[PDB]
């Protein structure tokens, strides 16, 4: 007799499926993890999301709701007494202009860091090269975006926020940017390089992101699943 | 900034349209500005310097960008029209609702432009294939409608954040059906019914076009 029976379908390195993770941790909300073959998809998660087929699938009394961002503000929406990953505009204040701040910078999120990301380990040469030059200014324009903020969320608050949480699983990434894209995070956008430190830190975090070591490994072995 | 609200948009715009149909909705009314996309304003370049795309509201000086982001903002700036997505604390079900229609508006942004853009962009075998997978698109979107009146609540007989998210794409149906060889009659009768109801809403009369003024401007496109 807590709040909810909660089951998440994803795979290990998923930084879709880190975000649903961390985020739960944030709100102390207890889920049992299954961790899905991709490759030899479940018959539950077929049935679950049958749209798109792929993880994170939150269960929430075996109703599923897919799509990490969707899962991020459902966490938010169905359990109002747990720490907050949006303002509530159910206060008014400049909330209503913060959520669409928030929910702008997550689906940019969405929109870069994944695919982008995966050109420097799918390209070689120049091209990687060029790929690299896009992942630096998208750096720097998460960068520009934290401004002086010690998080993303606006703020004071003093723990993780919907963008917080949305870009923190890439963090575990950057080391292999940093390889494969030829340029130091540190170098290019050094307050979101302290940024990804201090989110490091976090119990949530710490509990639920990968090294940066076994990360690279992974894009090791996606670096040879593709071309042979 | 003489009124309120002002929206940077383009005529033809689905994403724009979104955003007219739902300040309507809402009795909001609002300034439209027309962008030359080919020559975007010093006001759009500033406001949404990210992407630089419209629509862009401007409430009070202050930017909103990204369409299903405006929509959510409409609700959460003002409260006291009538809602796009149910309030999550004031059925019981409201969190899951919510949660199904995000999914649903998300799955227009990630297929109906993009897998539409090819019927008139490619021309043969490919073009046949672009039309393919737009009827079963379509079809999903009619098994997740149902037998119901709108996607959203149902019971209020209005348009929810679904609803509105997917209704500007009901001017290009006809101009998928030529495109990509198929009807949605066939396809998807009870999303046709839909649109069929969707366009006797004062907002809908309003803000989009005839599915022929569409399709020629489809024609224009490939002339170009
Ligand atoms: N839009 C998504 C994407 C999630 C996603 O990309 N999941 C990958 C794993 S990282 C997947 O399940 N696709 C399955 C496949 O490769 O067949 C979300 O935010 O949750
Ligand atoms: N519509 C896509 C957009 C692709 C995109 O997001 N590009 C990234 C690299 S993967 C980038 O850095 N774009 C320019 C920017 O964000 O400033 C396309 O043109 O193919
Ligand atoms: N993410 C979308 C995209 C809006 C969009 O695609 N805008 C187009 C016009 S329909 C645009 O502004 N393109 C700018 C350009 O062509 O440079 C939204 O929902 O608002
Ligand atoms: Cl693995
Ligand atoms: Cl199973
Ligand atoms: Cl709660
Ligand atoms: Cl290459
Ligand atoms: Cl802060
Ligand atoms: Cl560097
Ligand atoms: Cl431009
Ligand atoms: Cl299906
Ligand atoms: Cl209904
Ligand atoms: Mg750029
Ligand atoms: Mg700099």
């Known amino acids: 007799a807590e709040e909810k029976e909660l089951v998440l379908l994803d795979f290990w390195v998923s930084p879709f499926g880190q975000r649903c993770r961390i985020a739960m941790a944030e709100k102390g909300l207890e889920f049992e993890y299954r961790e899905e073959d991709l490759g030899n998809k479940s018959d539950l998660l077929l049935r679950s999301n049958p749209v798109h087929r792929k993880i994170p699938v939150l269960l929430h009394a075996g109703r599923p709701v897919s799509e990490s961002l969707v899962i991020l503000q459902y966490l938010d929406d169905a359990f109002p007494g747990t720490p907050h990953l949006l303002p509530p505009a159910n206060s008014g204040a400049d909330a209503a202009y913060a959520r669409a701040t928030a ?25 990687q090269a060029a790929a690299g030059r896009e992942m630096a200014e998208i750096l720097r324009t998460l960068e520009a975006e934290l401004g002086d903020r010690e998080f993303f969320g606006g703020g ?46 976090i119990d949530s975090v710490v509990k639920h992101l990968p090294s940066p070591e076994k990360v690279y490994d992974f894009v090791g072995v996606l670096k040879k699943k593709y071309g042979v």
């Open 103 to 127: 929910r702008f910078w997550a689906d940019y999120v969405d929109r870069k860091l994944y695919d982008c990301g995966s050109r420097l380990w799918r390209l070689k040469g120049e091209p």
């Open 156 to 201: 004071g608050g003093g723990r993780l926020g919907f963008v917080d949480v949305a870009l923190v699983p890439f963090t575990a990434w950057f080391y292999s940017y940093e390889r494969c894209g030829g340029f130091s995070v540190e170098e290019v956008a050094p307050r979101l390089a302290a940024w990804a430190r201090r989110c490091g830190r």
